[PDB]
């Protein structure tokens, strides 16, 4: 009941609809703390086998702390604009370097592992304690001091309790202090769920985020922030989905050319506005780089930093490309090469020249042969399409597709006065150039 598709023969493009939106509009920052110990070199000049292992595990811990201390020391995608991804978390850490902000956090978390702390600038952030190495080292490892270990399971327990810090240090070291995909070492799944549960958002947003934690991880940041006194702190910057559950639709385009027998003398045309389209508030967000949108079943996650704001009239380009309300963007060329585009529920085949183009399924083999021009085939009884030397697999999603017939628009142009090398043109701009060229030729 969800996904449908339509192919337009006039323009050689297809539209997929039936998807739902989840657009990241803002950021949410939280502070994660780890309590450290102040172990100083002990004498304990033993020779036991377990003492040596304990010493090695303490050396690893101290080297990790030193390394962390050293870490902090004093088409159409060209129209988008550039932002700064981690500005908010960096601002939070810039605040945390102030005089009493670490003390405030330390004194507000001693009784509980979660709390809301008001910073000196008035902003209140979630602070959450994930690991307590101070307690296990000060007590139960240096009892008031275990200089001759009598149990082997002490070594194993200490090794288990130390892996988290080493893994975090490694991840921060190989990334210069900023890890885009937030690993389960930085935040476990239970901790991430507990953190989502405390955001001041609606229950619908919480349900959307709780069922897609793998996307939330993929769209998050972790920033190494500070390590002073006996506290390790880093900021986690989570996505905020301000717009959810609105209709979304994808556009696929392929070149459209004439089919003259002579090798040259052929003109081509292509729509350049392929991408994802979602309507949020009385307008449409357009994402030219469809690689920047994650898809889970019929839910699309897109980032507004990589979008343009367009009027709702843009949708008229699919129904009629010559409408006066909106000017559709195209590209003209003179090189006709065969290729294929795999859509949501089928494939578009532009087969030109002397290439051999076919569609097949596993049981019966070839079940269609394509002629020169642009054509479409549904995935209902087709498994693969082969264009020249290339073989493609079609998606096997369930849905209905519709074929719309019409005369290709490249036949309405006169090749004599047709512009060719136009990368960033449109319908009106091509018409103006054609009109000027045609009006010039009236000499007498």
């Amino acid at each position, epitope marked *: 009941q969800n996904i449908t598709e339509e192919f337009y023969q006039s323009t050689c493009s297809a539209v997929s609809k039936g998807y*739902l939106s989840a657009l990241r*509009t*803002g950021w*949410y920052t939280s502070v994660i703390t780890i309590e450290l110990s102040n172990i100083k070199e002990n004498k304990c000049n033993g020779t036991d086998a377990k003492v040596k292992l304990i010493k090695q595990e303490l050396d690893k811990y101290k080297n990790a702390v030193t390394e962390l201390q050293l870490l902090m020391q004093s088409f159409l995608g060209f129209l988008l604009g550039v932002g700064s991804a981690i500005a908010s978390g960096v601002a939070v850490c810039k605040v945390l370097h102030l005089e009493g902000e670490v003390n405030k956090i330390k004194s507000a978390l001693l009784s509980t592992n979660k709390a*809301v702390v008001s910073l000196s600038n008035g902003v*209140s952030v979630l602070t959450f304690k994930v690991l307590d190495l101070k307690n296990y080292i000060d007590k139960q490892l240096l009892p008031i001091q275990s200089c001759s270990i009598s149990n082997i399971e002490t070594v194993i327990e200490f090794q288990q309790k130390n892996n988290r810090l080493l893994e975090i240090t490694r991840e921060f070291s190989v990334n210069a202090g900023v890890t885009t995909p937030v690993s389960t070492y930085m935040l476990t799944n239970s901790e991430l769920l507990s953190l989502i549960n405390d*955001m*001041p*958002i*609606t*229950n*619908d947003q919480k*349900k*959307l985020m709780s069922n897609n934690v793998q996307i939330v991880r993929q769209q998050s940041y972790s920033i190494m922030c500070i390590i002073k006194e006996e506290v390790l702190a880093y900021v986690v910057q989570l996505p*905020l989905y*301000g*717009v*959810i*559950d*609105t*209709p979304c639709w994808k556009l696929h385009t392929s070149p459209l050319c004439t089919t003259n027998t002579k090798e040259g003398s052929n003109i081509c045309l292509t729509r350049t506005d392929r991408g994802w389209y979602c*309507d*949020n*508030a*009385g307008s449409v967000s357009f994402f030219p780089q469809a690689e920047t949108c994650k898809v889970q079943s019929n839910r699309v996650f897109c980032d507004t930093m990589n979008s343009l704001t367009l009027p*709702s009239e843009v949708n008229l380009c699919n129904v009629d490309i010559f409408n006066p309300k909106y000017d559709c963007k195209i590209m003209t060329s003179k090189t006709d090469v065969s290729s294929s585009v795999i859509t949501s529920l089928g494939a578009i085949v532009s087969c030109y020249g002397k290439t051999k183009c076919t569609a097949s399924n596993k049981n019966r083999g070839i079940i269609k042969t394509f002629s020169n021009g642009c054509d479409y085939v549904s995935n209902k009884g087709v498994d693969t399409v082969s264009v020249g030397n290339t073989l493609y697999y079609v998606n096997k999603q369930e849905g209905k597709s519709l074929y719309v017939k019409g005369e290709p628009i490249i036949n309405f142009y006169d090749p004599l006065v047709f512009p060719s090398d136009e990368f960033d043109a449109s319908i009106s701009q091509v018409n103006e150039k054609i009109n000027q060229s045609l009006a010039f030729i009236r000499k007498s």
Partner: antibody, heavy 122, light 111 residues
Framework: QVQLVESGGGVVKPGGSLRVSCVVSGFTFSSYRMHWVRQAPGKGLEWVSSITASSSYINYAESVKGRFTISRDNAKNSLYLQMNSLRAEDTAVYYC???????????????WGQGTLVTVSS | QAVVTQPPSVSGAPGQRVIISCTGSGSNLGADYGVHWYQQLPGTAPKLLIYGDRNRPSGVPDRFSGSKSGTSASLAITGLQAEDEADYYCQSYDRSLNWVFGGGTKLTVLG
């Protein structure tokens, strides 16, 4: 100009059924969450039910769970409330309202309808 | 989980300044959810007076202002007139009860 027009109110006996409707115009109906709010005669306001732009998430008040059902039709720009097993305390004026929000903390109802009175009397 | 409380009634004299208060708990206003105010006339429908704790839509005569802090919010009216006799509501969001509304405060002007 944005307009929300409610209809379908009337008298009914306890344990009966009724269906109210609200037709909107002046904005994209499919980009917004919609709500139902009722007010008893001489009493305060009470939120009833909400529905997201594509029917994915639905919420009810604890006093109407299991008896009311919210739905919408995006093609006709209308949303519906089906009331079943009516009780005496369901007498009130029912409003349809559009959701406004800032993404994180603020959520309010800026545009309201005119209301439709529903009376449950034996 | 929580509830929102409002003074049943308030009175004032023309030209004076009255204050309406809204008191929440740790699940509505202690959970960082904003407060919003609505004005209702004797036979009309509610209309928005203040959103975002302090914001005013286009058409409110700038005589209404609100503020929030902790689990308390207030609406202040200066220059009381005879057209201000109306019911006033505060609404927020709750973790368990979702959208919640105050009890309602009816303003009276003496004279």
């Amino acid at each position: 100009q944005v307009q929300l027009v409610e209809s379908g109110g009337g008298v009914v006996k306890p344990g009966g059924s009724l269906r109210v409707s609200c037709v909107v115009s002046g904005f994209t109906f499919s980009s917004y969450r919609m709500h139902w709010v009722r007010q008893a005669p001489g009493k305060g306001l009470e939120w009833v039910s909400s529905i997201t732009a594509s029917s994915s998430y639905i919420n009810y008040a604890e006093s109407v769970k299991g008896r009311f059902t919210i739905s919408r039709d995006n093609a006709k720009n209308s949303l519906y409330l089906q009331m079943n097993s009516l009780r005496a305390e369901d007498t009130a004026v029912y409003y349809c309202a559009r959701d406004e929000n800032t993404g994180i903390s603020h959520y309010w109802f800026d545009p309201w309808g005119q209301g439709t009175l529903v009376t449950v009397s034996s | 989980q929580a509830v929102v409380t409002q003074p049943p009634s308030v009175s004032g004299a023309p030209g004076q300044r009255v204050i309406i208060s809204c008191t929440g708990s740790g699940s509505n206003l202690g959970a960082d959810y904003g407060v919003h105010w609505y004005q209702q006339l004797p036979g009309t429908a509610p209309k928005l007076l203040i959103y975002g704790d302090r914001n005013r839509p286009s058409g409110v005569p700038d005589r209404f202002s609100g503020s929030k802090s902790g689990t308390s919010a207030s609406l202040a009216i200066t220059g009381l007139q005879a057209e201000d006799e109306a019911d006033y509501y505060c609404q927020s969001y709750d973790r368990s009860l979702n959208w919640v509304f105050g009890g309602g405060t009816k303003l009276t002007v003496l004279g």
